[PDB]
Design a protein around this ligand. Structure first.
Ligand SMILES: OC[C@H]1O[C@@H](O)[C@@H](O)[C@@H](O)[C@@H]1O
Ligand code: NA
Length: 367
């Protein structure tokens, strides 16, 4: 029933959106960022995942990250080689998995990263002095996407559908495209240009566009207003997403576990209500407990609160963040377990839930 903003989306992209719309009522796809690239204790293997090492299954949704692509780098900001990334995207898609991509775009004014708050949005949008830079940046994604294509025996080009999730957490003040660093109207112009450029100028037909405010900067007494800060319009969004690490044990959150569980449910309930009103699909696009220090995190802090409310449960997927390689990154950062990690058995239970789908459990999503 929901319809994509790309009325000419490829058959596979249209099928994915339709099938997510159908599956969301009774199921939840599990996602993991950089899942094939490395794990906490390994890197190099061309077909491995911490998630699979624990459960025997790959995640249903594979998240990837393009930061650095726009600068012509051979690897992204976390040293994930782009050629390998293309291989991994194609591999996951070939197995029936779902692909989603975020983009921690470097600051074009300073050359710094996304956390360099030097103002840039006003300069990047149409009419701005650096508008040529925005086009060049987006062109690098167009080229990357070409490296995902195959051509069949009839000479037709095929691509993996991608849930493209740009300019995220824009209601936060930590990225240069965030509140305090860009006007609301300029953010909207940036978003709208991104869609026009990719969908209309460059005629990419394999994208589904995901919008993703951060829950930690939404007033729960006025959720809809907070959620819709910088909202670019229904003609520019397919997935009503949300990044919520807050209600799942963020170190800075003084709320009790019980209040956090209630807030998680409430945030997702309202997210789904917004999606329903707009004829879209909702998803928890980022979440997790860093270093998985919470007993029975998966069943008690994630699945439980989602399943407690039939509205909240209507999210289509939930993705947790990356399992940073320790030997490389110098600190422990991870959101899925690895073998021997304390929450591994509870993660197996999460996998075993009839509601939660990993790659091995997916129906054919692409028709
Ligand atoms: O993946 C992009 C960024 O995501 C953040 O949450 C951290 O994991 C960073 O170290 C990383 O560079
Ligand atoms: Na399952």
């Amino acid at each position: 029933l929901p319809a994509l903003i790309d009325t000419q989306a490829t058959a596979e992209t249209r099928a994915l959106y339709r099938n997510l719309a159908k599956l969301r009522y009774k199921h939840l796809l599990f996602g993991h960022e950089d899942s094939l690239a490395y794990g906490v204790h390994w890197e190099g293997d061309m077909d491995r995942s911490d998630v699979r090492d624990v459960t025997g299954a790959n995640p249903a949704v594979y998240g990837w990250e393009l930061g650095g692509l726009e600068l012509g780098h051979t690897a992204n900001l976390d040293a994930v080689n782009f050629e390998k990334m293309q291989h991994w995207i194609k591999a996951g898609y070939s197995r029936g998995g779902v692909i989603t991509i975020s983009w921690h775009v470097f600051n074009p004014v300073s050359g710094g990263n996304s956390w360099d708050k030097t103002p840039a949005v006003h300069e990047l949008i149409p009419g701005g002095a650096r508008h040529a830079t925005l086009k060049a940046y987006l062109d690098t994604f167009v080229a990357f996407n070409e490296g995902l294509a195959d051509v069949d025996a009839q000479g037709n080009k095929h691509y993996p559908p991608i849930i493209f999730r740009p300019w995220h957490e824009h209601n936060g003040d930590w990225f240069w495209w965030g509140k305090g660093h860009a006007s609301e109207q300029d953010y909207i112009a940036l978003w709208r240009f991104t869609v026009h450029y990719l969908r209309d100028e460059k005629k990419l037909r394999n994208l589904i566009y995901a919008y993703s405010p951060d829950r930690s900067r939404i007033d729960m007494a006025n959720f809809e207003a907070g959620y819709l800060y910088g909202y670019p319009g229904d003609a520019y969004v397919d997935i009503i997403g949300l990044d919520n690490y807050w209600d799942v044990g963020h170190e800075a959150n003084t709320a009790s576990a019980d209040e956090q569980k209630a807030a998680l449910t409430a945030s997702l309930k309202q997210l789904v209500q917004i999606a329903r009103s707009k004829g879209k699909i909702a998803a928890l696009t980022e979440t997790g407990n860093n270093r998985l220090t919470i007993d029975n995190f998966w069943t008690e802090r994630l699945l439980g609160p989602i399943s407690a409310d039939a509205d909240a449960s209507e999210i289509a997927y939930v993705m947790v963040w990356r399992n940073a390689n320790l030997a490389r990154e110098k600190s422990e950062q991870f959101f899925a377990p690895f073998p021997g990690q304390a929450t591994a058995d509870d993660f197996k239970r999460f996998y075993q839930s009839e509601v939660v789908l990993f790659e091995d459990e997916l129906p054919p999503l692409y028709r």
